[model samples]
Target: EANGNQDIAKLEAYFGTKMEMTLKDLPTVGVHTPSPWAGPYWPTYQDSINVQWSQGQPSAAEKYAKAFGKDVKTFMDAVSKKNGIDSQSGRKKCSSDDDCSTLTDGSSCSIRTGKTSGYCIPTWFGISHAWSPAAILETEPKCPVKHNGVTFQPMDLKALVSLVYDGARVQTVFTGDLNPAYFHIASANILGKLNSTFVADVTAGAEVWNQPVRGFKVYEQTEMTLEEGAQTFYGLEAYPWNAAAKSLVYVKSRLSWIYETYTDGGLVSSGQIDKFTTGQYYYYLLELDDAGEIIGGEWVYGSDDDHPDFLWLPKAKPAANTVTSVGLSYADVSMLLKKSAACT
Candidate 1:
């Protein structure tokens, strides 16, 4: 039961004797074409605000400091303050002790010192989740630009775009349960059929590692004998006899995407396809209807947690007035992008 459908004995019992056949293949998909038009490139922004400002290879601290007319440390302190951190206390600003508990990285409340209310010590501070969608939806910043007499470097422009999307709404599919069936269908339809890119949290757990999905490949698929099927799906209680599947087959798929590269805190230029690209392999069974159309499926027992948690597509940038972070508005960030593009 622990191995689920991956058990051979169970498969043998379910299918006494069955034959194998080649499963129908899915088309290979790519979104970098049409000359001068490539989908999202890998964003180099760090997942934490502190990393973006101070830790990345070419950190944005200097540029942002200049833009705001303050020294680097002062600018960082100010930004931290705006985000609910106290510079004097050296901890996160909070009204209650539990407020600090929600931080992804472990930290504690400062209230234990007998203050009316104290700050939180946050060890992590990045927003790769917001940057993931921004990289996919917005144009990459190509070069530095002089805006309002302050030079905004490429990293600065990238940071502004990330901040703009930190709270923006997006459209997502297969959000709740990324079962094998939903994962297969969404990957095929979104990447193969539509020829578009989307963002996904590749890790199927509480921890999130969002990346821009660029392509998918069937790679290989094998037909299973009834005996093989039963063996493979022996312990998976939710599968084997799924109501929608008239038949089933197994597939080995490869999904490719671009992710934040820390070597350079700047966008990879066009045609540099391999700069920060990477992928993962997934194994799952595909359910089919009488017409051979994919109906539903399940992950190979041991491989269930290896799949993506969910898939999502970003919409247009929020209205200028709607975004109010980092002391920059939509118009301010939009100008930086426009100016940076022109410089390139």
Candidate 2:
């Protein structure tokens, strides 16, 4: 019932089950070779297809950019603007949703919740990636040996279609409309669609597209920290962009570590394995544009946040309690005004 990893103990408390599997065993939408004795997260998931366990293959995103014709950096750069999502120059503040209902110029509540107690914020939205250097390919790698019944070297359009579909949906959600825009989603949701077998629409919610993906039966709302009042808040100028007109909005995601990775193994289920690169859950803040293009972002790493056993929540500021960055910045605390994804 106990593992030496303090963070794993915290994760066990959060996941509420014995985490006895490796990342390989965990379901994903990409190619990985899961080995029980070798991993809780191996980045491999096939027999002949994945020969070398060092790396899996080129990610769907990598293929997507090449097939559809664009680089990840190029696409992101084209869509980003400094403070483009942070601007509130012409926005109006409100204390309720009604205050934003009727705008002649075509703007609504700046807060994404549809209800607001603060002034309206306008922004452009795009995708924020939960990438692993070991798992998610940073550059073009290789292709599926046999996608469906067809076999190829790099990847054919048939195999590429699935990955393309996934990215297309992401593009639509981030750049297309605010209705389908979402976050704090199950990583397996993306994992479920990898083998070129998943399908959905660009107009669908992230949860909807992820529903077909495997490994979990339910997409439940879970917390990362075990502390009673513990909560992590990501406050910034950019939020999920509401597509009503050009008005930017806000949203939030609650997270906690469910696993801790180190050399020997993970704290809980990974402790009884061989040597490998240590991995842990990470978080970041991304800024996008009207076209749903990624421009810039900041990885949220600090004394208490994004660590294996650090406190995910923050202590309140006492000295300058009247809205200062002292407690809000890296301390892992801020205010929430955006509509909860559950509420919608």
Candidate 3:
């Protein structure tokens, strides 16, 4: 895929190369980007996923893969196997399942290494989280945690459903027969406290034995009947809470300390940018399975608008658990709606 979005003249001027953008283009996926290009990237600009991909990693190759997971994040393993994030390592040929489990999950599990493996053991602390579930999360959304020498985490707000026709009618971004309206969370209030807890726990190889509320959006957030008001909360933006003040916060701009532990991807949220500011830099995770499936598991800061739906391309920032060890920039990725936008 050629980077049609890049300006060839700019590359030539800066790098003395006849290139369009900083990111290299891929014939298969078009432009290659970091596995999960996360960012609280304070600036509002556009860049290619390809350029994002080439930047590099937190640790060696195999460690990266096991860190992020092969099924959900593909590049992690490749980079892990190739770069060896932690040690001066090399690939070992395990003749059987017993051998594979020794380096992998150990319980004699079957983990297909360097293969297009889709399944694996449920990891623990694959990512990180700020808060704990039992403390705050079930009832209300957004629980702030203190970490990384900072007092608060940035919370980039998101919406569930953008448009809904009367009641019963719905719409969404990721649409397919297999995935129904209910499965699509457009703008739902996320239980931040819960998410933070899971994010923190999973990145460390601790099994996620808890159930965190995962919301989806159908279309415009509204209820058909007054009794069905609960559904309105389905796909909504889950912002951060000031427990002491007993108020919800929507910040302008925030500072973040995004550290790259070079560990598992599950609990990558161990410390996320939960700030509600508009321009904080965060990383992204572009996890693609063998089936051309793109599971968006990255985080971002909120946009300047009441709802940051810029251009609808980068769409809204993940608002939780982003990629690691990469630079990023986002300026309210919203799509302007026009009856004639041709609707990108």
Candidate 4:
């Protein structure tokens, strides 16, 4: 299992002997590519459209800015200040589900920060993010393409929507509700749509986004290091005029997948056969943080709490407590999350 990819298609080939041919057995792959018979994650099922949005797309708060006219930035800023973070990060604080973007009047973040890292610190909420990037998604990447036999490229909100199990109920659970952590789930979930379709939301929770390996940096969350703790584009906003009410915080802490350029095969599967960018899974872990205030940064998933066979989990962390134990790389983990897209 370590060397093999977790993709449902491959699994079906191995396990479908019991069930025979059925879409239920083939879960969605996290990365998406547009196809004539199906949408991104719904590649196996013809016409199956699962509503999805990967991590690296534009920030949601900025996506809604078009309607605000010249004041679109104004609204984006309002959403930023509520996040209690540096404005330069320009995290996607709010999505269609409407979560983190505060109206600047509130002095704190409405979503997950490093509440796991430290205590809830006080904050001043206002519009910020004059130095933000990735505020524009969907449009950045032109079209979708297939990776490997199962994976896809140019994944975005539309790709996620295409993978929904029940097309009508797609937004019901993924409304981007910041009040609850479920909305922060950019990770994979077996969304079985009422229309008899199911797919994976490749874009799972990101414990960190775009912060550089050195610190929480700007740009994007993909391939970024854990040390940055993703200070950008997850739960942040800013004001057009008020700088005092602005701050940044890392809300997307549960990152399920990460995109990486391919070079060969993966470690567990075969070890880079060729050079091509791809997605992988994170060595799955559930952080049991004490309930308290919010902090965006988290210490590495540490060797002290891990088993020896795969102490590599700390590579996913800000600092490495040990050397790279033979397991999965961050990119390898990203591929696994996509591989686990089992529907039924």
Leading candidate by lDDT: 1
Per-residue error for 292 in candidate 4, Å, reads 49
How well does each candidate superpose onto the true structure, as a TM-score? Answer: 0.70, 0.18, 0.19, 0.20
In candidate 2 the C-alpha lDDT for residue 174 amounts to 16
For residues 1-344, what per-residue lDDT tens digits would candidate 4 score against the true structure?
Answer: 01112232332343232211121122223322111111122211111111113354333233323322324345434433332232323433432223434443222332322222111222322111110111111112223333323333333222222111111111111122021112111122221111111112232332112100100111112233222222332232321211221122232222222122211112112222112222222222111122321112222233112211110000111122221121112233223224333210
Candidate 3 residue lDDT tens string, 67-153: 223332444333233221211122333334444454653322223334332222222322112111211121111322222222111
lDDT of 3 at 37: 13
- State each model's C-alpha RMSD to the native: 9.9, 24.8, 24.9, 23.4
Candidate with top TM-score is 1
Off by over 4 Å in 1: 1-26, 32-78, 82-125, 167-174, 233-239, 263-267
Residue range 119-193, candidate 2, lDDT tens digits: 443221211111111112212112223323322332222222211222221211111121112111222323233
Better of 1 and 4 by lDDT: 1
**All candidates in order of TM-score, best leading:** 1, 4, 3, 2
Backbone clashes for every candidate come to 14, 19, 110, 89
